[PDB]
Amino acid sequence: GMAYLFVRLPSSFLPDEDQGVFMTMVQLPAGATQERTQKVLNEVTHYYLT
Amino acid sequence: QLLAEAAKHPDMLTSVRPNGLEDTPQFKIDIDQEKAQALGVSINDINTTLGAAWGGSYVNDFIDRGRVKKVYVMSEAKYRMLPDDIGDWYVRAADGQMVPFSAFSSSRWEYGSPRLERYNGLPSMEILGQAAPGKSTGEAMELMEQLASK
Amino acid sequence: DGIKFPQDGTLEFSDVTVDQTTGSITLRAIFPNPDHTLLPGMFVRARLEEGLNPNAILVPQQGVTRTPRGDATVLVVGADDKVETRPIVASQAIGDKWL
Amino acid sequence: ATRAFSQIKDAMVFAFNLPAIVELGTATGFDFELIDQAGLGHEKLTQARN
Amino acid sequence: LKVNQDGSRVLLRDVAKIELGGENYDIIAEFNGQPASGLGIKLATGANAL
Amino acid sequence: VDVITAIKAQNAQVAAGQLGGTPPVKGQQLNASIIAQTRLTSTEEFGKIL
């Protein structure tokens, strides 16, 4: 039973914890300019703050 | 292909994304040095004009409120936005007459990559992802390892 | 300064030869100057007129991509709502739209 | 030497002995430093020092 | 830029729009929707974060 | 010296810049890189130096 349960148990390296800060990455279609990226970031920040 | 195959298991892999810009079109300006030299202009003048107008050339330093800051020289927005604007620039010839840039130049569109990544010397490309909720990163690693052997 | 001249002129062709050290042709235009608002010898920018042509297709720039070969392609959608790739010929770009 | 040198005109001349260890300054007194942190210039800095 | 032997001259302001600007406009920042600037800081290899 | 100058002039790389420059005019949607003259890559190309 020990052997079976040891086999069953999944593996990892380190647990992840709440830290109060996280990040968001935005990638537009290739050849996009600054204005479209600014519009997308405005959408993102408006959603986050509303 | 790997991304398409990994998109088929939402129960274990979530937010599987690449890390880097994919590919962009590029602009190529063909300068006919034969015609340019026949007209009277020099290659150095053409190169300096193009680089300073469109790329911007760092020139010198100057003090400002007791601090040294650089002075830049660059075209003013409106004249470096479209390919046709390449016809608005003029170059002085040998005898002093001014010749337009569009009498000895051509334009061509090509393809290219904006960023190239190498791992351990060999060329490589990097992707990221997160394990699905209720799962562990080890299972995601195992699933991607077994997906990579095809 | 960029201020449009109040009066309008006409164009009369005068020179057909091509300069050797400039590769350019010199068109000639006449202008009524009753107020003497422009002296002989200054530098001006003349805007001509060619003609309208309603065989014009304008496509927004962000929708047109380019294949590795060099030609341009666009993404169309068919009757069955299935997307397809259509190669096109994009010669000129006006404002923010390919023609 | 200092007594016999104060009578010399057109010259401020002094004589002294080297400190105990001539590798750092004398450990007597304090070394104040007025600093410009706004870009006032040399004239304003000299006026403030005075 | 060009002075003939009669006093006629060509000044820089007749060719350019000289003004104080940024070194490069590639990066912009926005804090809660308002314009802002930022200084990001990375810890060196081996130190105390606190 | 003429050959040296010609080689130095016709075998150089120039920073052409970027289509749709870093400060964009209001209403720009196209952005790409300009590839100007580059270094020669063959003997047959070197033989055609004027």
CB pair distance less than 8 Å for F27 and C93: no
Shortest Cα distance, chain F CAs vs residue E24, angstroms: 7
F10/chain E closest Cα distance in angstroms:
28
Question: Quick one: closest CA in C to A31, which residue?
Answer: C62
The helix/strand count (H/E) of chain C reads as 0, 8
- What residues in D contact B65, CB-CB < 8 Å? 39
Shortest CA distance to B74 belongs to which of B91, B50, B57? B57
| All residues at 6 or more sequence positions from B39 whose CB lies less than 8 Å from its CB, including other chains | B93, B99, B103, B104, C20, C21, C22, C23
Q: Please, are residues A37 and B31 in contact by the beta-carbon 8 Å criterion?
A: no
Tokens of C80: 């069955």
d(CA B76, CA B74): 7
Our CA-based measurement puts residue A38 at a distance from the nearest CA of chain C, in whole angstroms, of 15
Instruction: Give, as one character, the DSSP assignment of residue D46.
Output: H
Nearest-Cα residue of chain F relative to residue B49: F16
Q: Of how many residues is chain A composed?
A: 50
Contact B23, F28 (CB under 8 A): no
Instruction: Check if C24 contacts B (Cβ < 8 Å).
Output: yes
Q: What are phi and psi of B4, to 5 degrees?
A: -65, -40
Which string of DSSP letters, residue by residue, matches E4-19?
Answer: -TTS-EE-GGGT----
* Nearest residue on chain B to F35, alpha-carbon basis: B28
Give the gap in angstroms from C-alpha B93 to the nearest C-alpha of chain A.
36
Please indicate whether chains D and C are in contact, defined as at least 3 beta carbon pairs under 8 Å. Answer: no
How many angstroms away from the CA of A19 is the closest CA of chain C?
39
CA distance A15 to chain B (A): 9
Nominal resolution (angstroms): 3.4
Nearest CA to C65 out of C81, C85, C84 is that of: C85
Are the beta carbons of B124 and B2 closer than 8 angstroms?
A: no
Residues of E in contact with F33 (CB under 8 A): none
**HEC readout, B72-102:** EECCCHHHHCCHHHHHHCEEECCCCCEEEHH
For residue B135 the two structure tokens come to 């799962």
Which residues of chain C lie closer than 8 angstroms to A37, CB-CB? none
> Could you tell me how far CA E13 lies from the centroid of its own chain?
19
Q: Which domain holds residue B34?
A: 24-112
Provide the experimental method for this PDB entry: cryo-EM
Find chain E residues with C-beta within 8 A of F22's C-beta: 24-26
Mutate to test the interface with F, among A35, A37, A39, A40 (most CBs of F within 10 A): A35
Angle between helices F2-10 and B43-50 (to 10 degrees): 30
Is some CB atom of chain F closer than 8 A to the CB atom of C65?
no
Are the beta carbons of A33 and F32 separated by less than 8 Å? Answer: no
Take residue C25 and report the two structure tokens written for it: 């042709």
Q: How many CB atoms lie within 10 A of CB F9?
A: 15
**Do residues F32 and B43 touch, judged by C-beta distance below 8 A?**
no
- Residue B73 has φ and ψ, to the nearest 5°, of -130, 120
Give the number of other CB atoms < 10 A from CB of residue B103: 19
- Checking chain A for breaks where C and the next N are over 2.5 Å apart, the residues before them are none
SS (H, E, C) chain D: CHHHHCCCCCCCCCCCCCCCCECECCCCCCCCCCCCCCCCCHHHHHHHHC
In this structure, what token pair is assigned to residue E48?
């105390």
DSSP-assigned beta bridge partners for residue D24: D22
State CA B111 to chain mean position distance: 10
Distance CA D35, CA D46 (A): 11
B75 in Cβ contact with B54 (< 8 Å): yes
Q: Say how far apart CA B7 and CA B17 lie, in whole Å.
A: 10
d(CA E40, CA E27): 13
Chain E: residue whose CA lies nearest to B55: E24
- Chain C residues touching residue A36 (CB < 8 angstroms): 62
List, in sequence order, every residue forming a beta bridge with B14; answer none if it has no partner. Answer: B130
Q: Work out the burial of residue B50: count CB atoms within 10 Å of its CB; fewer than 13 is exposed, 13-18 middle, 19 or more buried.
A: buried
F37 by DSSP, 3-state: which?
coil
C-beta atoms of E26 and F22 within 8 A: yes
Chains that touch D (3 or more CB pairs under 8 A): B
The verdict on a CB contact (< 8 Å) between E17 and B76 is yes
Tell me, yes or no, if F13 comes closer than 8 A to chain B by beta carbon: no
Closest chain F residue to the Cα of B56, Cα to Cα? F17
* CB-count exposure of residue B81 (10 Å: 0-12, 13-18, 19+): buried
Q: Do C63 and C54 contact (CB within 8 A), yes or no?
A: no
Query: Do E30 and A41 count as a contact with CB atoms less than 8 A apart?
Result: yes
Q: Which amino acid type is present at position B122?
A: L
- State the Cα angle at D15 between D11 and D18, rounded to 5°: 145
Using a CB–CB cut-off of 8 Å, the residues of F that contact E are 22-23
Of A8, A11, A16, A18, nearest to B136 by C-alpha is A11
CATH number for position B77: 3.30.2090.10
Dihedral, CA atoms, B84, B73, B46, B87, nearest 10 degrees?
20
From the list B64, B70, B76, the residue facing E23 with the nearest CB is B70
List the beta bridge partners of residue C59.
Answer: C98
